[PDB]
Amino acid sequence: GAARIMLLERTLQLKEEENKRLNQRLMSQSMSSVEKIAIRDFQVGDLVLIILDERHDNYVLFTVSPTLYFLHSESLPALDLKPSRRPWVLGKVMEKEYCQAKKAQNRFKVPLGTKFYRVKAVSWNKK
Amino acid sequence: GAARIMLLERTLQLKEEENKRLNQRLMSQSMSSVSEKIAIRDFQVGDLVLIILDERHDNYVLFTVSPTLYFLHSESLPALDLKPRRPWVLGKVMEKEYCQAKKAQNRFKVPLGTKFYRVKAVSWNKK
């Protein structure tokens, strides 16, 4: 009986310490929740550098990766890009689509069966 | 002391329920929570930059879409396996110095009186 009461008081103190620790952790996590370009894993809202590729006749997002990210045909004219012309521009990625070259003679100048991304992006100016 | 033991069991049960509710709140907060980068404009020490070869000026330059020119340091060049012929590589900036072209026959091929930066940076390897 005495052992049960002592154990219950000890575990109750342990639970109280846990309650203080968890409440303080919650307050700290709520406290800590609050111009650079993305290079690798592309997500919507990321800042990217669109450069002109000539080997493939298109504009491609700067990528330090084997996968090729091309710019979408509808996204080209929106940022005053003419269908030679400008070497690079800065933008913000809005949507990405996984595509594959089903035809050997394509506009992307990629070999047959190559999988790549097509990105719809909009220009991004400083704020 | 059965009454005392039961009182302690109830109080312990209440405290553990409070702790579990706080833990569920923490998990909900963590789930509501969201989920490298290159510096292009104003470089400060420790930023990841993209060193590319410039052809007009016989040097490697940090990519900048800004009027000021950031050159790579002559001594830092061989450290990141660039010989004074990779096209580009990315590194981490370690120190910058504000300089001005005092002679018309300078190595940077900048006009007389041009102000620029010289940055010593080190290669960057991803884990």
Is residue A74 in a domain?
yes
Q: Which long-range contacts (CB under 8 A, 24 or more apart) does B4-8 make?
A: B4/A5, B5/A1, B5/A4, B5/A5, B5/A8, B8/A5, B8/A8, B8/A9, B8/A12
Looking at the fold, whether B18 and B57 belong to one and the same domain comes out as no
Q: Do B115 and B55 reside in the same domain of the chain?
A: yes
- Cα separation, A40 vs B36, in Å, equals 7
Residues B23 and B54 both lie in one domain: no
The neighbour count for residue B79, using CB atoms within 10 Å, is 13
What is the Cα–Cα distance from B119 to B72, expressed in whole angstroms? Answer: 5
Residues B73 and B109 in one domain: yes
Q: Write out the H or E segment, with its range, that includes residue B22.
A: helix B2-32
Strand B115-123 and strand B70-72: the pairing is: parallel
Q: Which helix or strand (DSSP H or E) is residue A5 part of?
A: helix A2-31
Interface test with A, best of B8, B9, B27, B56 (most A CBs within 10 A): B8
The verdict on A58 and A92 lying in the same domain is yes
Identify whether residues B67 and B20 lie together within a single domain. Answer: no
Neighbours of B60 (CB within 10 A): 25
Kindly state whether residues B72 and B27 are assigned to the same domain: no
> In A, residues 63-122, which contact B (CB 8 Å cutoff)?
64, 88, 90
Considering the domain architecture, whether residues A87 and A64 belong to the same structural domain is answered as yes
Asked whether residue B31 is domain-assigned, the answer is yes
- Experimentally, how was this structure solved? X-ray
Q: Are residues B68 and B21 in the same domain?
A: no
CB B108 within 8 A of CB B59: yes
- Report phi then psi at A42, rounded to 5: -85, 130
* Residue in A60, A62, A51 with CA at minimum distance from that of residue B49: A62
CA A92 – CA A7 distance, rounded (Å): 60
CA–CA gap between residue B119 and residue B74 (Å, rounded): 9
- Tokens matching residue A78: 């929106």
Let me know: does A115 contact A99? Beta carbons within 8 Å.
Answer: yes
Distance (Å, whole) CA A53 – CA A59:
5
> Cα B55 to the chain's mean position, in Å?
26
Please check whether residues A2 and A26 belong to one and the same domain: yes
Does A23 sit within 8 Å of B26, measured CB to CB?
Answer: no
Q: Which of B12, B33, B38 sits opposite A12 (nearest CB)?
A: B12
**Residues with Cβ within 8 Å of residue A126, at least 6 apart in sequence:** A35
A52 falls within a domain: yes
Structural domain including A100 reads 47-123
On whether the CB atoms of residues A19 and B22 are closer than 8 A, the answer is yes
**CA distances for A70 relative to A22, A83, A98, B63, B105, angstroms:** 47, 14, 10, 21, 42
For residues B75 and B121, the answer to whether their CB atoms sit within 8 Å is no
The answer to whether B95 touches B45, Cβ cutoff 8 Å, is yes
Within a domain: B40: no
Among candidates B1, B26, B38 on the partner chain, residue whose Cβ is nearest the Cβ of A5: B1
Identity (one letter) of the amino acid at B109? K
Q: Which residue of A has its CA nearest to B23?
A: A22
Contact A12 B9 (CB under 8 A): no
**B119's tokens:** 């940055």
| Neighbouring C-beta atoms of residue A62, cutoff 10 Å | 19
The two tokens of residue B73 are 């340091």
Cα A60 from Cα A119, distance rounded (Å): 9
Selected residue of A36, A50, A92 to mutate for chain B interface (largest B Cβ count, 10 A)? A36
> Across chain A, which distance is largest between two alpha carbons, in Å?
91
Cβ-contact A42, A61 below 8 angstroms: yes
Query: CA-to-CA distance for B107 and B112, rounded, in angstroms?
Result: 11
Regarding whether A11 and A54 lie in a shared domain, the answer is no
In a domain, A105, yes or no: yes
Which residues 37-66 of A are in CB contact (within 8 Å) with B?
37-40, 49, 64
A78 within 8 A of A94, measured Cβ to Cβ: no
Total domains, chain B: 2
Could you give the CA distance from residue A40 to residue A48 in angstroms, rounded to a whole number? 10
Report how far apart, in Å, the C-alpha atoms of A94 and of each of A7, A53, A90, B103 are: 59, 21, 13, 48
Name every residue whose Cβ is closer than 8 Å to that of residue A34 and which is 6 or more positions away in sequence. Answer: none
Q: Tell me the sheet residues that pair with B119.
A: B72, B96
Residue A113 · residue A99 · CB < 8 Å: no
- Residue A33 forms contact with B (CB below 8 Å): yes
Spatial distance between the Cα atoms of B62 and A98, rounded to a whole number of angstroms: 32
Residue that is written with structure tokens 């579990």 in the block: B20
Is A54 found in the same domain as A10?
no
